[PDB]
Design a binder for this molecule. Structure first.
Ligand SMILES: C[C@@]1(O)/C(=C2/C(=O)Nc3ccc(S(=O)(=O)N4CCC(O)CC4)cc32)Nc2ccccc21
Length: 274
């Protein structure tokens, strides 16, 4: 801990306040987060989960009951990037690239049976080189929460990350959150008002979901042409497949990387204001 020099607070977090700090020894600029034997074993495992599209968990410093997560440092997050683009919007090639990289990150994690669980634009860090990385692998915002989690499912799968990335994908195209709920029922209902109240037809087993209510209003689905305009048919197809109620039928990241949409994928660089 005495190996670091906090240069300034750069954000916070459901766990802790993240600082920017240079390694007094190596000069290495990092993102210093200041946050249970299992909550140490688990977080140290991630240390071995290295992929280009996953922010690097350089180290973990549990000192004097104070936990510190020394992370690699990226200058900007997606939320502030999307904010800095609300007027023009992020170009489609950058949107495509990003989705593609995150999906490669997710594919890597998912292959290792590790889920993020809390995918948000603020956990997606970008750099001037054009990459995007999955920060803070999730150990107060429901906008991007998959419906199985809202319906009380306790053993939700990797498919939840996909739904979030779907919602995030939509938000980058639309410059507006897809399902901004202020409560869990409002979150669920907004999803309902768009994708149609789920039922045994489109989602076998939904009716047995812990928090499922036979009394849920019955909203009819709406076309994605109205959901994510002006996203082309390729993207809307991928989105709908990422936003499928039935988790089992929800497309995987691995499969998503092979969607015709990613045919013309490139690696454009953003124009960061640092
Ligand atoms: C997200 C971050 O705080 C940040 C971090 C970084 O470079 N590596 C990190 C690794 C993890 C997290 S976090 O996803 O654990 N976290 C804290 C910030 C919050 O808004 C979301 C959750 C923050 C950062 N750099 C910058 C720079 C400008 C905006 C936000 C940030």
């Amino acid at each position: 801990m005495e190996n670091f020099q906090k240069v300034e607070k750069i954000g916070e977090g459901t766990y802790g306040v993240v600082y920017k700090a240079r390694n007094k020894l190596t000069g290495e600029v990092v993102a210093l987060k200041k946050i249970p034997s299992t909550a140490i074993r688990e977080i140290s495992l991630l240390k071995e989960l290295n992929h280009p599209n996953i922010v690097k968990l350089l180290d973990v410093i549990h000192t004097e009951n104070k936990l510190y997560l020394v992370f690699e440092f990226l200058h900007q997050d997606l939320k502030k990037f999307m904010d800095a683009s609300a007027l023009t919007g992020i170009p489609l090639p950058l949107i495509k690239s990003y989705l593609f990289q995150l999906l490669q990150g997710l594919a890597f994690c998912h292959s290792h049976r590790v889920l993020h669980r809390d995918l948000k634009p603020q956990n997606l860090l970008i750099n001037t080189e054009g990459a995007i990385k999955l920060a803070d692998f999730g150990l107060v915002t429901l906008w991007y929460r998959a419906p199985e989690i809202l319906l009380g499912c306790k053993y939700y799968s990797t498919a939840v990350d996909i739904w979030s990335l779907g919602c995030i994908f939509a938000e980058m195209v639309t410059r507006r959150a897809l399902f901004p709920g202020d409560s869990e029922i409002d979150q669920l209902f907004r999803i309902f008002r768009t994708l149609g109240t789920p039922d045994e037809v489109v989602w076998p087993g939904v009716t047995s979901m812990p928090d499922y209510k036979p009394s849920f209003p019955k909203w009819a689905r709406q076309d994605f042409s109205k959901v994510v305009p002006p996203l082309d048919e390729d993207g809307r197809s991928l989105l709908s497949q990422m936003l499928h109620y039935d988790p089992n039928k929800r497309i995987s990241a691995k499969a998503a990387l092979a969607h015709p949409f990613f045919q013309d994928v490139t690696k454009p660089v953003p124009h960061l204001r640092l």
